[PDB]
Amino acid sequence: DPFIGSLETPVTSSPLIAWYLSNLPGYRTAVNPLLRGVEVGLAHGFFLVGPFVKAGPLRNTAYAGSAGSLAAAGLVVILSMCLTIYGISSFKEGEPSIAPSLTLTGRKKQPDQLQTADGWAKFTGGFFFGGISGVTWAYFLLYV
Amino acid sequence: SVYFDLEDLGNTTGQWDVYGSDAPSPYNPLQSKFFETFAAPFTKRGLLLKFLILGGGSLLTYVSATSTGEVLPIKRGPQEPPKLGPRGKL
């Protein structure tokens, strides 16, 4: 459909790119949001640990690792608070989900349960748990 | 070459999920069971918000108060002798 505000380009719609993007935890549909949130939090915490322990104000002392890990944990906590606030303010309790119900082929599919109050709450809880676990695992690996 | 119909507006205005996947869960059942069991207390929204705010405040205050003078220069205090002002003021 040319008149929709989008274009078909090699990068936008490629077999490799579509396959890679359709396997990320944030794009699965049949999976309950908690596991995907856990995976996302683990990845984000493990990524986040580094720069704080490397470029912080105490990077030249013997307190680099602990201070950096604590800073990463604080960032994870703040992100969890932001996610909870957004979920409260955006989605309502009893209303059905607002996800698209048909794919490019036009075949009908079950709407994603992430775009709902309970689904977003599960996602945020999983993200918090995964982020904390990733932060502590990165701290354990780096300085042991 | 028809791009408009009134029976179903889903394809007319473009309500597609471009990168949506409907495959079954590939996670190990034991892993999923463990994570579901150990992530239960954080599911509720208001309780999570209250716990996050209270715990963050308490932890930040405790770390700031307990921290010694080696980490914080402001907790070390001045060391050099004081100096006088321009016109002899103290």
Binding site: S89 | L49, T61, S64, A65
Partner: peptide, 30 residues
């Protein structure tokens, strides 16, 4: 004594965070 070490972080960070969260929730609430 050490009152500033306890009071400055509270006014600086925790209270503005609570105020911003509450105000955003009240603004967007229908």
């Amino acid at each position: 004594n050490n009152l500033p070490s306890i009071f400055v972080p509270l006014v600086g960070l925790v209270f503005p965070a609570i105020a911003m969260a509450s105000l955003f929730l009240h603004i967007q609430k229908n």
